[PDB]
Amino acid sequence: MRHPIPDYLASLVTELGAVNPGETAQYIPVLAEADPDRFGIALATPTGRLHCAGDADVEFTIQSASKPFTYAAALVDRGFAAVDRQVGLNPSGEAFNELSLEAESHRPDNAMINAGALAVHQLLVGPEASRKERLDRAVEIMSLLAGRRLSVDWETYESEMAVSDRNLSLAHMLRSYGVLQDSAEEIVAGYVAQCAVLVTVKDLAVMGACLATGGIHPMTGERMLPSIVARRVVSVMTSSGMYDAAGQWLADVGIPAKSGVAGGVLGALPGRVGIGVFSPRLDEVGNSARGVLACRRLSEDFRLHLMDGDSLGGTAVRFVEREGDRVFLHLQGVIRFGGAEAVLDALTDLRTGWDAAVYPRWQEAAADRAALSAATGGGAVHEAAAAAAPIRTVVLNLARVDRIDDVGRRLIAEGVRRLQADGVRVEVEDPERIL
Amino acid sequence: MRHPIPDYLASLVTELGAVNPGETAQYIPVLAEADPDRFGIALATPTGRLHCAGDADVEFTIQSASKPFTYAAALVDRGFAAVDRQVGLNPSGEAFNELSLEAESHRPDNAMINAGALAVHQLLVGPEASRKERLDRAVEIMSLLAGRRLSVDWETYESEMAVSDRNLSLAHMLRSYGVLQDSAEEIVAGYVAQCAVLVTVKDLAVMGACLATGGIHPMTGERMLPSIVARRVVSVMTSSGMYDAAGQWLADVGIPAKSGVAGGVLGALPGRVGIGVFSPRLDEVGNSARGVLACRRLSEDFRLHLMDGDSLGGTAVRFVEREGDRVFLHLQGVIRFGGAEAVLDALTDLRTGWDAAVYPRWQEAAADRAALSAATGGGAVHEAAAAAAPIRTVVLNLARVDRIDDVGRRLIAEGVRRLQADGVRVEVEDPERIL
Ligand SMILES: N[C@@H](CCC(=O)O)C(=O)O
Numbered sequence: 020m021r022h023p024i025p026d027y028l029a030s031l032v033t034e035l036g037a038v039n040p041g042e043t044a045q046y047i048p049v050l051a052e053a054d055p056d057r058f059g060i061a062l063a064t065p066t067g068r069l070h071c072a073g074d075a076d077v078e079f080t081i082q083s084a085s086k087p088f089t090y091a092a093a094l095v096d097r098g099f100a101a102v103d104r105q106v107g108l109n110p111s112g113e114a115f116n117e118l119s120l121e122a123e124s125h126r127p128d129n130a131m132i133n134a135g136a137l138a139v140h141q142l143l144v145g146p147e148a149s150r151k152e153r154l155d156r157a158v159e160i161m162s163l164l165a166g167r168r169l170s171v172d173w174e175t176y177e178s179e180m181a182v183s184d185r186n187l188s189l190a191h192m193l194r195s196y197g198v199l200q201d202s203a204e205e206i207v208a209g210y211v212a213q214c215a216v217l218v219t220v221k222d223l224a225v226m227g228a229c230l231a232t233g234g235i236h237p238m239t240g241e242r243m244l245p246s247i248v249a250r251r252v253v254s255v256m257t258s259s260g261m262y263d264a265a266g267q268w269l270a271d272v273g274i275p276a277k278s279g280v281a282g283g284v285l286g287a288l289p290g291r292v293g294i295g296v297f298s299p300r301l302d303e304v305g306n307s308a309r310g311v312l313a314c315r316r317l318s319e320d321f322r323l324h325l326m327d328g329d330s331l332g333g334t335a336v337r338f339v340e341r342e343g344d345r346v347f348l349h350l351q352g353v354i355r356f357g358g359a360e361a362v363l364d365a366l367t368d369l370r371t372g373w374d375a376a377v378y379p380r381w382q383e384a385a386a387d388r389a390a391l392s393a394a395t396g397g398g399a400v401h402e403a404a405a406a407a408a409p410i411r412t413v414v415l416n417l418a419r420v421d422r423i424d425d426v427g428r429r430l431i432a433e434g435v436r437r438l439q440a441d442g443v444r445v446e447v448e449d450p451e452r453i454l
Numbered sequence: 455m456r457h458p459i460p461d462y463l464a465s466l467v468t469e470l471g472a473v474n475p476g477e478t479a480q481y482i483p484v485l486a487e488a489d490p491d492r493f494g495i496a497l498a499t500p501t502g503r504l505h506c507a508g509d510a511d512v513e514f515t516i517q518s519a520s521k522p523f524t525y526a527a528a529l530v531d532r533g534f535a536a537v538d539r540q541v542g543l544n545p546s547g548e549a550f551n552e553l554s555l556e557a558e559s560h561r562p563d564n565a566m567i568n569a570g571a572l573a574v575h576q577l578l579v580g581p582e583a584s585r586k587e588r589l590d591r592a593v594e595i596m597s598l599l600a601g602r603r604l605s606v607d608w609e610t611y612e613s614e615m616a617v618s619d620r621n622l623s624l625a626h627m628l629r630s631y632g633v634l635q636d637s638a639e640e641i642v643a644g645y646v647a648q649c650a651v652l653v654t655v656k657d658l659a660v661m662g663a664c665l666a667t668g669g670i671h672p673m674t675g676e677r678m679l680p681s682i683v684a685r686r687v688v689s690v691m692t693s694s695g696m697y698d699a700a701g702q703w704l705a706d707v708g709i710p711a712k713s714g715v716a717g718g719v720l721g722a723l724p725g726r727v728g729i730g731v732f733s734p735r736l737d738e739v740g741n742s743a744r745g746v747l748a749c750r751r752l753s754e755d756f757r758l759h760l761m762d763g764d765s766l767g768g769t770a771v772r773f774v775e776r777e778g779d780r781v782f783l784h785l786q787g788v789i790r791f792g793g794a795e796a797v798l799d800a801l802t803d804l805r806t807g808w809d810a811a812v813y814p815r816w817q818e819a820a821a822d823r824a825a826l827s828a829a830t831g832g833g834a835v836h837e838a839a840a841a842a843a844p845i846r847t848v849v850l851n852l853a854r855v856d857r858i859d860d861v862g863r864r865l866i867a868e869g870v871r872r873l874q875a876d877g878v879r880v881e882v883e884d885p886e887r888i889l
């Protein structure tokens with residue numbers, strides 16, 4: 020059959036395309052004369068699927084939506100310590116205040132606002148890196164997530180470099196407080212090229228997806244970024260991506276996202292989906308009108324909110340079989356704290372916090388563990404307590420476990436270490452050595 | 455064996471308990487003379503497990519950590535429209551500015567700051583509700599999540615009511631802009647009692663857990679709040695819970711949390727865990743010092759970050775068996791967009807977005823779907839494409855699916871509707887009618 024998601028994408032494009040409020044970025048000639056009658060949208064899933072509709076294969080400059088990529092690239096090249104000394108974590112409106120830099124800190128508020136982006140571009144490769152290297156580190160980091168070699172639209176670069184007075188101002192002010200080493204024109208030029216990189220609504224959906232999964236590319240399964248770096252970038256996208264309207268956006272939508280004045284919008288909901296939207300005309304605060312609306316919809320119709328839980332839970336426990344003398348534990352999925360934590364409940368729930376008198380209700384509910392389990396979501400863990408409803412051997416089957424982060428390994432290891440201590444054998448049937 | 459989490463909780467209490475910086479709330483006599491040598495912590499899981507350490511069963515006033523409960527209660531009693539007209543969604547520092555209310559809006563910035571809390575207390579039952587009802591609606595909503603009838607510590611209430619000049623000021627100012635109907639003293643009194651409700655570090659962990667799961671109580675599986683309301687409350691806790699330091703907190707920790715000046719801290723990470731911490735002494739901005747640190751740790755050691763993905767993904771597909779003429783699909787877990795979306799991939803992947811030439815790398819990776827699957831986390835969906843590696847009947851087994859939200863139902867329904875349209879039989883073996 021044909022997948023229903025792309026069909027949904029097409030319906031949304033037609034419904035919201037009935038109109039076209041706002042206007043194109045007027046502070047640059049190349050973006051003013053752009054056709055406002057375009058509008059695409061893509062959804063890239065963690066697994067590797069890509070759904071689309073409308074003008075999702077038309078190119079446009081990534082502008083600001085490029086900020087989380089260079090922040091991520093710079094974090095890897097210099098590490099947290101070095102980047103944090105120049106870029107803060109406080110949300111702010113693009114309107115620049117010098118008091119930002121007078122603080123004991125001496126650093127722009129965050130990496131989503133121009134001042135913060137200029138500081139990040141300056142940190143790109145190292146202290147002795149040339150102008151030319153930083154700009155390739157930019158195009159490179161981005162290109163590695165989009166999946167292909169990207170290019171800079173010099174026509175836009177030149178158009179913007181001719182009227183880049185504001186940014187030069189932020190760059191100078193920054194040098195004044197020692198946040199920038201090199202020259203103002205040098206970092207501005209590199210920053211203005213970085214924003215001139217061309218992407219399609221689809222690339223953004225795939226790039227957003229890399230950040231969504233913790234640094235894993237959904238089209239190859241190859242780690243592009245460390246989970247810890249990808250985490251922070253999505254953290255700052257959420258808290259400062261929509262500027263002073265971030266509180267209202269985190270509640271109204273739930274999708275960490277940065278918008279570009281060329282019309283593009285990037286979205287990345289941790290562990291669920293990379294998003295890309297494209298619609299030239301900008302609203303009253305500078306974002307992509309139809310683009311920002313597209314996200315509202317997706318978020319309401321699919322409950323794609325950051326606060327809408329979607330864990331594995333006890334579902335990490337495929338099943339618990341007490342054949343007779345030995346008990347078999349088969350794990351499944353991607354095991355992190357959530358899953359490993361449930362495993363530890365299973366293991367403990369084999370015979371190897373509240374006063375029942377005070378909570379008659381909780382004891383009753385507990386009496387029926389199968390019922391209380393489905394109402395809550397702990398897969399087949401209740402099958403452990405049921406196996407013990409002597410055990411001399413426990414088998415940990417890991418054939419169905421896609422992967423397990425460090426925290427899971429340690430937690431399940433410790434779990435194993437504590438069983439043997441009980442005079443219980445423990446065989447870990449783990450084929451593709453993952454443990 | 456003994457579960458390793460509580461042991462970890464005890465280690466953390468001893469390690470971080472080596473010290474005790476800051477001091478108790480000095481603007482109230484009853485909280486100034488409180489013993490600073492106490493410190494507990496609890497973790498309530500979605501499934502129904504409760505882990506503890508230290509003074510987790512000692513009572514203390516919930517103060518501000520009560521704000522998300524009354525905001526949630528008021529949202530249910532009056533609905534979004536009515537509450538949003540009085541309470542905004544913008545983050546802010548407790549330092550009050552009158553320009554907040556001059557805006558076209560005429561409403562405090564958010565429901566986590568005193569002004570915003572006073573406005574929420576005023577909306578508690580209805581326009582014709584008495585002073586006495588609102589205060590019970592407060593204690594009630596909270597008590598229903600903690601799992602037991604709670605009480606107001608009048609000793610603290612009286613102590614604070616004697617020096618409640620600041621709050622009265624916020625209350626008056628609000629009446630001035632028409633955000634409060636009743637009297638200033640009336641709402642202040644009710645608000646000061648609401649903060650005098652006594653909880654233990656454990657109750658907070660269970661209460662945080664209700665919000666964490668989308669409104670489902672982890673100790674009974676009974677829905678206490680609508681998923682949509684629980685969502686917003688966690689959204690505003692995240693964006694404004696830590697005030698002007700929320701950007702740095704969302705990155706440094708990732709756990710939506712509100713602190714109380716009595717020493718308690720509430721945490722609620724969507725779909726993973728309810729948290730409770732208790733440590734009388736407050737730091738330089740008013741939060742619980744050791745309490746705020748406890749959260750930092752938990753978040754770093756267990757990767758309990760809001761941005762650290764933890765989905766079900768393709769793991770919703772237990773397996774795909776092509777016995778021969780018919781194909782069997784067994785689903786599992788709690789199915790939302792994430793899971794339902796994978797099902798639709800399975801169904802479509804039975805023979806009933808990118809240019810391969812451009813992405814040689816992606817085609818290679820795709821060639822080995824089993825490998826690309828484990829690197830990414832899509833359970834056993836690749837088993838569908840493998841079944842078709844004619845099909846006249848497809849069986850949807852739902853015995854292992856704990857539950858499925860509205861979005862899942864519609865998505866899997868549509869999926870079903872599109873298969874039959876292909877001249878394919880479709881039997882949904884779903885025992886406890888969930889579909
Ligand atoms: N590329 C623009 C930024 C566009 C935006 O703010 O989205 C600039 O450097 O000024």
Ligand SMILES: N[C@@H](CCC(=O)O)C(=O)O
Binds near residue numbers: 517646649716
């Ligand atoms: N109960 C205190 C608030 C404490 C806090 O801000 O955490 C008050 O009403 O002023």
